[PDB]
Amino acid sequence: IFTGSADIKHLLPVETQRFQSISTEFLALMKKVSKSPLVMDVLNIQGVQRSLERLADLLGKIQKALGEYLERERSSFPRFYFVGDEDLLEIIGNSKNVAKLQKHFKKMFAGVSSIILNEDNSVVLGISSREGEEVMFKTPVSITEHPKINEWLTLVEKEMRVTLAKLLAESVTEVEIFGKATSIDPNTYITWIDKYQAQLVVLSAQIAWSENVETALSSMGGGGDAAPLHSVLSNVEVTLNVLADSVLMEQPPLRRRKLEHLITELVHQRDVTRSLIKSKIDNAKSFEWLSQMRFYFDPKQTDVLQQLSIQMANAKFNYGFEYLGVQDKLVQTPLTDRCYLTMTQALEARLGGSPFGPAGTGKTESVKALGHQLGRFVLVFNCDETFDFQAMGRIFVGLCQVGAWGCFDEFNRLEERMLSAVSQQVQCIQEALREHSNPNYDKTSAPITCELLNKQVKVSPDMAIFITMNPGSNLPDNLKKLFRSLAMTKPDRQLIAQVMLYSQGFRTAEVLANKIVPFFKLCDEQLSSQSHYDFGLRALKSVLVSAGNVKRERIQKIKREKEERGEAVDEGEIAENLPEQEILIQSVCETMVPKLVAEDIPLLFSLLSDVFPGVQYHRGEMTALREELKKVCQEMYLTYGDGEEVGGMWVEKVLQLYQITQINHGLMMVGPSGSGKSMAWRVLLKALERLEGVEGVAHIIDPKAISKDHLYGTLDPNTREWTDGLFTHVLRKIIDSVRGELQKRQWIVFDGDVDPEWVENLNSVLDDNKLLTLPNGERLSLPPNVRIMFEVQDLKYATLATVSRCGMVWFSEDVLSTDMIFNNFLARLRSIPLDEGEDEAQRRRKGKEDEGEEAASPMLQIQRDAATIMQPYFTSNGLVTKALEHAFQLEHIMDLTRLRCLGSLFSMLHQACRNVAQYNANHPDFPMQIEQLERYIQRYLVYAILWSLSGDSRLKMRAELGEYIRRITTVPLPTAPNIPIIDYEVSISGEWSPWQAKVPQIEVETHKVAAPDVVVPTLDTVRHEALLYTWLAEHKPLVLCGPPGSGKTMTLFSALRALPDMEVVGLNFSSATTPELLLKTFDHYCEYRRTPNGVVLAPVQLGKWLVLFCDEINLPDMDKYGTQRVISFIRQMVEHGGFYRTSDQTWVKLERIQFVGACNPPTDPGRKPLSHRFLRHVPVVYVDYPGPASLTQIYGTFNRAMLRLIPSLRTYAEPLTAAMVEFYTMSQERFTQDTQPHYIYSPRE
Amino acid sequence: IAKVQADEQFGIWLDSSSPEQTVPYLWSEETPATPIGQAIHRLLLIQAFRPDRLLAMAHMFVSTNLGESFMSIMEQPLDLTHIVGTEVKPNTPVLMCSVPGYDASGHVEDLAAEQNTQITSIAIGSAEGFNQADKAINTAVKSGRWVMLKNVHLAPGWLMQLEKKLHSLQPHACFRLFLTMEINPKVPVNLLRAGRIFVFEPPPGVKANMLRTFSSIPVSRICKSPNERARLYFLLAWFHAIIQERLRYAPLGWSKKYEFGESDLRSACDTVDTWLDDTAKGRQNISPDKIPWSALKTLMAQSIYGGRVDNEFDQRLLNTFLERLFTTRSFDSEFKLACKVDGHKDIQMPDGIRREEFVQWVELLPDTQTPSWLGLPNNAERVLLTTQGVDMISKMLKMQMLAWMRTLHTTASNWLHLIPQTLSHLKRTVENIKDPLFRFFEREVKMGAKLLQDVRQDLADVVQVCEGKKKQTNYLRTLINELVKGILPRSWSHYTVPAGMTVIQWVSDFSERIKQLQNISLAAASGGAKELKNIHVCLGGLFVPEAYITATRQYVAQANSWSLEELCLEVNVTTSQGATLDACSFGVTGLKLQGATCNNNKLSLSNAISTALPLTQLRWVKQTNTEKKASVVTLPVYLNFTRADLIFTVDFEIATKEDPRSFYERGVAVLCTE
Ligand SMILES: Nc1ncnc2c1ncn2[C@@H]1O[C@H](COP(=O)(O)OP(=O)(O)OP(=O)(O)O)[C@@H](O)[C@H]1O
Ligand SMILES: Nc1ncnc2c1ncn2[C@@H]1O[C@H](COP(=O)(O)OP(=O)(O)O)[C@@H](O)[C@H]1O
């Protein structure tokens, strides 16, 4: 506290000196204890305990004194109660550094976001709002004559109120002479609008209309003719026509918002005047007129705060003259008229208002609009989990002292204890307010006090409290007799849209609203229920604003096109000759189509053509970006399509993603697994880099692979040192721009599920504030080029707060057709060699066309030949597609994804081409010709489809897939009558060969008859060893699942040990498994080598690869939001090929690491099913029990090895084994797990 | 059943006002039954024949068993003297629970005045209140003083501490603690268990309500000039009494039980005072024309009372009351507060202009209040009585619940036999997908089939576990408890159902819905798409009937190429069987009309409980700017009898000379299901 400020010592001279003395003694004791850090030496210090008790006493006293000073400062200027202790210290301490106060003005005041200072920062010239709007003080306040923050800040507030009052007085003076005219010049009207503030212009229009109506009624009460009201209505019509003509043109955004507010107000004024004319109101005291909000302006009043009176029904208020800046004007729908009447009636009786109803009806918005209409500072308390309870008593004290309104958002969602505490505080405050209503109470001296924070606080009469409720529950019992409740059951969306469209220049606003509102109702009802579907009134407002923007863009386009040629331009003529329905439908589709799933798009278009008949959507193509996308997709072997062509939907999704990036700063891709999200944003980034010339850098930051503290950073509780988290470090590195990072497009992709733990701190980032707050206190402003991106699978565990804060493109699984995946595989095979390691890898980047390097390696030639051979099988109506479609019908032990099977098949075809290469290298004299290569490739293709699609299923269903293949294929198959085709293998020669030819009847010796390191070869054993070799030569995170004891780990070890290059690190997982275990395994068996390219994690043993056996992938427990943390870490570190450190916060790239693991069926208890995003890379093998014949063979060999000890008993080797096998089978089919959970009978028994 | 046809005098008893008094002999028995047997047999007969008089038969059955005067002592007012002086221990707190909105401290005040024992009354809810309560209790323990602690329901924690304190005390014989409170679940169970609970309900009756209101308002406030204020207050009190009594007959009177309490009364009184003072300017008398009737009506309809009203039709009904009562014609000597009390007698406004005359008039009201006083139909009392009878039977059945594997097994087997097996999903055709009706029916059949397979799997697994062959998972144990206890399982609630619905009724309606969906699927398979337009579907049977209305609108708009926003619904009731359907007309079955009869598509008021519309036809015609006629009334179509879900609002035309205000006040509405 006393070191982070420069003026803090001046304000508390006794205190600062006291702490300084305490600090000198404490530093002396610190040096003394540092000399002898031993505890025994510490306890032997002469009188350390007495001095320490003295220090504790004094430190507590100065801390209390500091609190008392802060309380005095708050009480001497009420608005500091709205801002925290640390920020209070920052404001009071940085008196000379006035520029540091600019970031707290948005909390103390309503619309005040900055202060216009002088050249030397000694005189506050005026106030600047958040939108850049400024108010110039009539008499500027001088900091020099009032050095204390208190006095000059209070003078700022007071003279701001005074200058607003004077501005309103002269504004009324101008709008009077505006009103008393049958024709207003648009130029002078626009000059008046620009020259004054939006709030003040709106109030001036309201005052002028109210006084005109009052005078008209007064004249009518004596005359009896309706002419004055007709004149007033005609004047309002003329003003609306002028405003519409002006808003049709091009205006600056501030003047545009002023025009929108004026149109919204004058529409309501015209409606009220029409109602008065129709009702035939003659006297000014009729309730048909008294019920409307009336404004009375008397400049003769000496006090500015009492200059303006706002009266409706019985209640009459005084304008608080709080400066609100450019707020959002409410439409004044009749439901809000009922709201205004009820709330003002409640405040007249000194009761708080409690509107209730479903969300989205505009409860807190209506309360805030009512507060702003009276010019009262209104705070909205979001009652969600972002609840600031500890400082709310201070906030209520501030509301009492300054006269600011306070509104809660959803009072029922508070927890019971917070609800009770806030209810008690509100009850005390409301009783204090009701004490103002006693007629016998003296008004000359009215010291009304309320008990808050164990002290008496004066409650201003102007302050009020609103509690917004939402049934489905009701107000607390103590607050039921003090609050007037109101039912916000249904907003009048038709009038909402009609007025807002009329304010946007749409001539046919009524028809468009009457069409758009039921259309949104149909979108809510007919369309499939999704979490991210927002069809409330806010979405409708945003869509209508976007439609207005599109219409203005069309008008500007037509005007520029005409000015390019030799014809004149008339804005009204262009606007008249313009289809509004097409603009509205284009806006709706642009806003809503990307958010929709594949099946809902035809539903959207059907409903949209039903409501809007005869109009169509024309897609806005981007030819330059289209060509760039085509070039980039060709560069990295993707399939590209236009419109209905194959790949057209994916390109459309990429274009929608580009639009969302242009519009929003935060956005999400919420496509299911294996839909093309990563490739979409990668190709978009590279296409933008190649088009705009701005280098694009992406920071894939997995949010769940590391803890929240490791992601955001944690502060040391003792030494108060701040450690930057991964996201915070990345953001700080971008902001600093030591290497020109502000000149490059940074995309912070998260690539992980979203849950409401690590997105809580991102809420401020995703807001319009674009600010990041840290526990230390530093505030990080999001640079314009930084684009927060989320690449998630679903939204099952995401709050509405983070979803509504960002744009979204849904990448439905129908987007990624199997044809383009096949084309990608074929192109990658035809271009990317496999024998290449570090060489021929960067050379692909070096070669834009790779001319002259076609016959670089015989590997490339043979894989081109193989791809040419298998091309007729990977077409749309091909063998592989039909096999995949059939296998989707088949059931699998793990849930089945298309890309898992496709990746497994691609890997085994890669192994087929590598086997061809090996045979070619072993036969230099006769290389394999085209015919033998074709035979082998077709045979291995059938084999690979069979072992990839059905590799996860069980035996007879594997035979089912095999017979399906046999009836759908044309390649010759084995001709044996009654043998499964999976039993056959493919040799180098074209013909098949049974696996039994590779199953020798070995003879184990007497010893090690049952030793663990004994693997008697069987059909299943040899097939699985071959499959393991195939999937380990590709270095994939292969996964084996099966019933316990089936032989998973054994066969994996047997297959892996045949390769003298990989060492297995067995890791056993369970419910307590965390990525920290993998980190310890890494730092034990590996080291972080500092390669110049980047930090590389490699095993200590050079030349030998590392395999990490994870015995149980399933057991790690799902979190409360699912998505096992270690599984997500493994996914990130196998897909992106690396992970982020927890100390340095730099990318680490793995080298020579594999992640082969074992599992159990998910149907077994405690086996959590694996996520699709992780299962996509990993192939899965079903290692079932050996079965009768395999058991007989293996254990006959074992029993022969046994009874070799006793020569006489060897004759009983096979009967004994047969007895063992039959007894085991009978026991296994007798004691099912249903009877008892421990009745598992594995070959381990 | 045979005896029903053989008795010619059955009609005079069935339609009798009090059939339960004289139940004719209709049972066959071998030996003449004892009087208790006669009572129970007649109770069953009344339950089957006239369930509304179930309570009345119940009282005589209790009288036959336990003596006539068993319930007599309850009717007499509660005597505090003997119950407090005797049979209550000094350490037992007297918990005077009351229905919210009605106080009970006055009874204890009168008791203390009669017993000439000084007493202190303490409010609860504030810290100094707690301190004063503790000090007064401590003083009373050592001095034998009575202590009141008002509104103790606000502090459950302090209630637990107070109960703990009262457990460990040595109270004096004259000491006694009175805890007045309101009905609220937040209060501790231990305090209720250790106290002599007393329930103080407000006495029902319009007369009692207006006496309470007039006693609450001080005489000086009413006596304030002008003298028109007394009549204004009497009108306000009458209106408050009408709505408060109408709250009882729900949902017929009010679509839901709103919280029309004393706070609204005080707010309305303050509004009347302020506006009458503003208009009067202190004059001793003002003409009734000059009274701001519009201001009072608007404030009492939008803010004072209509703030808590969310349903549009309840707001319309409140507007009807306010426009009928608060008018200049109210000051006329022949003004009729209520019309058609018994068809002949009409309650008239008292001619007096003073508060004492108004009190004298209200005290002279006959003690024969009927729902027609409130504007409700006379059979509303019958509906309330039969609802109370059903609730009383359910309450005793829950009481009697305090082995079952075979009963659950046979119940589940019967349910599985009753419920149909399978639903066939509609086949997706490229031509059929464009039809909105086909899309809606496809969604219906898909979600209904999902629910059907879920329910059938659950029931079959319940049958298996009741056979002792399957383990009990958490979902299973929960569902078994729900079925055994009778609560509808939460899993089988994917479509809106009436609140407090037993599982058996849900199963019956589920089977009916799946039968209807099977018929729809068969028709769609047979005809493809033409038959789906010419199918008569019950709106109650459909899971989301508003989606059906939307689908009909969409189909009409698409077939005739009109825009969807230019279509309005016209309802025609045709009694002919199999009436022809126009190209833009859809048949509807099962609609039930409440409180009216429709003849030639023309409403007429009736005293029947409900009237079944033979064949409703919904037609979508192009919107016309022609003004609505004065004889056209808008009726809500509630999903069920609870009147909690609104689907669409039909329009109908009034027959002969019937006032639409009566239609609004009588609670006339259409129900998709009964
Ligand atoms: N347009 C395309 N044309 C051809 N192949 C494509 C295309 N898009 C994607 N693929 C292929 O399909 C794979 C899946 O795409 P991508 O990796 O982008 O998915 P993802 O959505 O990030 O996956 P997951 O959500 O499962 O993590 C790509 O790696 C690529 O091999
Ligand atoms: N009368 C109205 N005029 C214009 N917009 C409205 C109106 N009523 C509601 N809205 C919009 O509906 C949204 C509702 O949000 P809000 O009022 O904050 O939550 P709630 O409706 O739950 O109180 C607001 O964003 C507001 O813009």
Ligand SMILES: Nc1ncnc2c1ncn2[C@@H]1O[C@H](COP(=O)(O)OP(=O)(O)O)[C@@H](O)[C@H]1O
């Ligand atoms: N073909 C085979 N050759 C050798 N041993 C086998 C064979 N089939 C089954 N076994 C036996 O089955 C057991 C498999 O157990 P194991 O794979 O370790 O279980 P888990 O995979 O659950 O750890 C081994 O102990 C092994 O002796």
Ligand SMILES: [Mg+2]
């Ligand atoms: Mg909200």
Ligand SMILES: [Mg+2]
């Ligand atoms: Mg991805």
